[PDB]
Amino acid sequence: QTLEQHDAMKYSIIVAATASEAAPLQYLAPFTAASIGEWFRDNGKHALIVYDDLSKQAVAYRQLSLLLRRPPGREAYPGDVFYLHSRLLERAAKLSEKEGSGSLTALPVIETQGGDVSAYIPTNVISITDGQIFLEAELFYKGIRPAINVGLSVSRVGSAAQVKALKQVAGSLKLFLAQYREVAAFAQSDLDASTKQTLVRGERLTQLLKQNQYSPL
Amino acid sequence: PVQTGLKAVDALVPIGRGQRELIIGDRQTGKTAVALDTILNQKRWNNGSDESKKLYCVYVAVGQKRSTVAQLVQTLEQHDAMKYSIIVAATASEAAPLQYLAPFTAASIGEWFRDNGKHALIVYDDLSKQAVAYRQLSLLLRRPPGREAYPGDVFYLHSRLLERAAKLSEKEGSGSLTALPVIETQGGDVSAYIPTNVISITDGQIFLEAELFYKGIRPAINVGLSVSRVGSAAQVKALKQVAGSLKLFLAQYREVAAFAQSDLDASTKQTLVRGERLTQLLKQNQYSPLATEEQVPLIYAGVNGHLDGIELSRIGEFESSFLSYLKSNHNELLTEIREKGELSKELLASLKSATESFVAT
Amino acid sequence: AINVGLSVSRVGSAAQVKALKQVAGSLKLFLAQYREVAAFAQFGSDLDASTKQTLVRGERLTQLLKQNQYSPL
Amino acid sequence: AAVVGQEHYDVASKVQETLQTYKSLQDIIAILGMDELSEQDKLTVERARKIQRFLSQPFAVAEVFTGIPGKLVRLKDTVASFKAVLEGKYDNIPEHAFYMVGGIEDVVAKAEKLAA
Amino acid sequence: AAVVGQEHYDVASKVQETLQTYKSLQDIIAILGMDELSEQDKLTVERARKIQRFLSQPFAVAEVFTGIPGKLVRLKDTVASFKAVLEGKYDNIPEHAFYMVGGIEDVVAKAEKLAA
Amino acid sequence: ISYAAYLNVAAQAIRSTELQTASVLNRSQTDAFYTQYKNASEPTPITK
Amino acid sequence: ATLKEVEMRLKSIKNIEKITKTMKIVASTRLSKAEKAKISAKKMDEAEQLFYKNAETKNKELIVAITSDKGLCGSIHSQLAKAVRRHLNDQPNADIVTIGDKIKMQLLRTHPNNIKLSINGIGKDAPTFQESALIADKLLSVMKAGTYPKISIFYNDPVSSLSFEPSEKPIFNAKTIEQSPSFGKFEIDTDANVPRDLFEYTLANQMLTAMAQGYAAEISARRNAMDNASKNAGDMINRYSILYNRTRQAVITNELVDIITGASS
Amino acid sequence: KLQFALPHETLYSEVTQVNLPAKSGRIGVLANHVPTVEQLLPGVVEVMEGSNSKKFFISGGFATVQPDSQLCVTAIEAPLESFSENIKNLLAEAKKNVSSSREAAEAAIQVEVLENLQSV
16 A cells, blocks of 8 residues: 555565465475566566565474474474575575576565574575674664665675776775764763764764655665 | 461552462462461461351362471471361372362362361462472373473463462352462563463562561561552551552662662661661561561551661660550551551541650660 | 693592692692783772782783694603 | 481481571671671671581592591481580580581590690 | 794794783683782783684685675784784784784874874 | 870770760770781781 | 673672772772871861961972872872972972882882882771981981971872862971071970971971872772762663664574574575 | 862851961961961961950861962861860870871971860
């Protein structure tokens, strides 16, 4: 409904595999969705897929795995869970110019348990993916959106989307906002004008991020 | 009500009829002493002849050896209390069916009394050992695993036993099966699968503490971490008046005893003085019950600060002297207090007067 | 690597050299007291002479104890 | 309290208290320091140290540790010598003269030896 | 010391020890402060922070995160850089002059940047 | 001695009807004990 | 394993918090008294300062500095050690008198030979006239105060009951009074012993003043430091609580699985 | 005006008349006075505002009139009529002992306090 009020439903697909729904339907939910996405991809056209949340899929599969007497890992999750997360994610890929230049973007969305990221599932998705978009509960709480720490986020060989415009103005604002982290580490650093200038910039910048939910720029 | 003979339990976290609440505590910290005092106190009603006030006590020793129980019987016999106490025993040596079926056999004896219109009281010792026996049975019959390697279906066992302990309608003769389960903890763990089940089922807990024991206070019952869900609805009127105050005085003293000695604020130091005299008052010797007529005068002395004006060392002395002094002058006021069950403005006038003459000497 | 804090011999000793028992006679008590004193020493609390005695003695020994790879003697 | 007799019981309780105050005080002494203790407290620290080293008795079968033969200590002699420390009449005796002793006779003998 | 040279081994011993001191004190530094810890030990902590920032080295294929191109530094050159620094002959410049720099010369050159 | 040591003793006699208030009584007493010192080297301590 | 070691440590953080709360409260009790004391002492001093200015007193140095016998006062010890350190660059030989156990250590390392006289220092009560007078009396003999042209006192001024600035003041010697006009706008006699006595009396009054001011800052400072510690230990109790919980949950699952593989085989 | 304060309490004020006993005999000051610096000996001290009178007992100190009616009195621990017999008996013993026991000066100062008190 939300999409249909804002005029945008007709260029999106929604797949549903609810929680009342049987354990294979939830399991097969991401693999099927990605089949539709690949058809868009292999026509050389660009696409996107959001798998929300794969950790609940891991649960749906767990009941099946436990009855199939396949080893348990951390949190009672399948030993064979790993194979699922990799097989699915590598479908949403950038392709060569021989293959049409077809995209299908992945931004796999994980539901932490107790916001601990040393959990079996969180580590398994980080290791496949190039970079993280770590989100923190606290930056969301004190009215800032987007609530992403760039201190916890990284981007490896996924880092590219910076053209000239976004090269000149700052050649990555994230490194500078990991300069702010230092000054504000030991402020609460220097009483020298250098740290205070960064502090004063970092504070203004953090305030400037704050945005309203479902209103983008 | 029901009087256990310990002043702390009857006022802070009262006891009732068909009212079950734990006695969950650490190993050999005088668990049995908390319980034993109550059976011995039930001798008081037994001696008379109103048989709707007579709790015919049952102590159920489950997976607890014959040596330990032989003290238990001996102590009862000395105080002449094997003529209403019943002791159902499934010992450490005796097999897992007998131990599994020991709380079920004991409750059932109590049902005859309860149905005929009477009351009776069952003290289970201990459900930590009931669980162990079910584990032995499950594992040899290859029943499903659960938490901590004890069976998953243990909950169902405990729940069936504890829901028969109830205070019935007048129709069913106006009787009940009062209960007091005793649960054995591994150094104070309550987060442990077997404690945790029982804690939810039962209404109230009493939690004994290892520290109090070491500190030479025995019973080592710790009454801050004791709550009863139903509690004071079953409480003597007399004891509610002179120890409402008593909760608020001891409650402040704990938090203000997180401040330790050099010297402190004028305020803070006062609170410790008041709390401490009360705490020594509530240190009592074990296996010594108390009547309603001798619990009620002492607590009023604490509340009204005629006991908290007198040195710590002299508290123990004060207690007996004040009691004797009341029996010699006016045993009329004590008998009046007891049988009315309540304090009237005429008794409350008098009760202050009396404490004053006694404090003077 | 070597640690002497959690190194015990239950039965008790009799297997060393006679000469080595005497010389290390009270070495065991010094090192065992030192640990406790050392822990206190880090809070930065002012310490009395009885405590600083133990702290000065213990420290010097510990430096004796320390070794480098491949020194049979 | 009756099986081991009232005196015995009362003495062993005092010991249990004094040591327990000592252990509560360990925390205070670590951080706060030892001179921010009350005078009652300071004296309990001191008797508790004497008591703590009054547990030390060598054995014959621990002549693989100390090399000093064993002792035999009678039940009444333990009750009386601990009591004396706690009553404050036998705080004239140092800690090391309760270290490595038998019975009462021994405790007296060790007071002389260290002085010389 | 007989393989990679003795100097190397002496330096390496110190680097583990100075850093072990800074690990020991982590509770106490956060709860309390550094003028509440002993002066020698405070120095070791500043010194260990310098060592910890130094590990910041611009890299070739981590060029994006460092934000500065790669640095190849010899083993032999490395022994000297750490050896001097442990002797505090290059503690007289900021503890952020050691952040994202290759060799020793570079450490000096960033302080001159920073001061401006 | 010193003039301030002379005046100090008279004051001690005066806090000794005999007594006043807590601040008087507190205001004469030694919390400090003379630690003899020279050179580093530290000769034994005696009461101030 | 991990679990008990978390747990034993979580109790450590917990107990440390309790102790720092306790400390801050005893500080508050003492601080009330300390302040009371500093006002009367500073008050006496001012009447004196009224003489010294108007006389135009003018003109080696002695250094006295003041600490308790207890550590953990925040950074009072080392701000004081430091401000002492500066006045060893302005007199590269000055004789340091350390009144207190804490300051004594810091300075003695820096130069053992400047450290000449030291005391056992002030107790767990407010500085007092008797102590300062007597230390002053000893000062005359050992340090030979009267030859020196200057004597100088260092302390911490409690600016606010949340702040401290190390501050200093000058105790006027016996030489000064004599040659400043004192027949010229004041009336003294040559048959007065007033200068050699006035020197000593302000040696002790001024020193009492300084002591009081430092001691007040110290007791205020410990309250502030120990409050910030209650919060710091708290932030850490909460962090070890999150670990404690996670850790118990993994143990339960790992226990379970062992039974399951066994039943199954 | 009068500034007069003790190390245990502050109690100083235009104070009309003040009368002090000094190494210069006895001195009385009324409003502005010639500026001298004089050491106060053990003393009975009077301060008057209106015909109302206040009375102090004093261990000694220093007095300096600043020439503008500002009478700086600085003195240690004092009470005179509330400083009052048993203390006089105790002081007499203290006198005896101190002679036999700087110690010569200690004994002299003690004699002055017994004498200052007996005059009251």
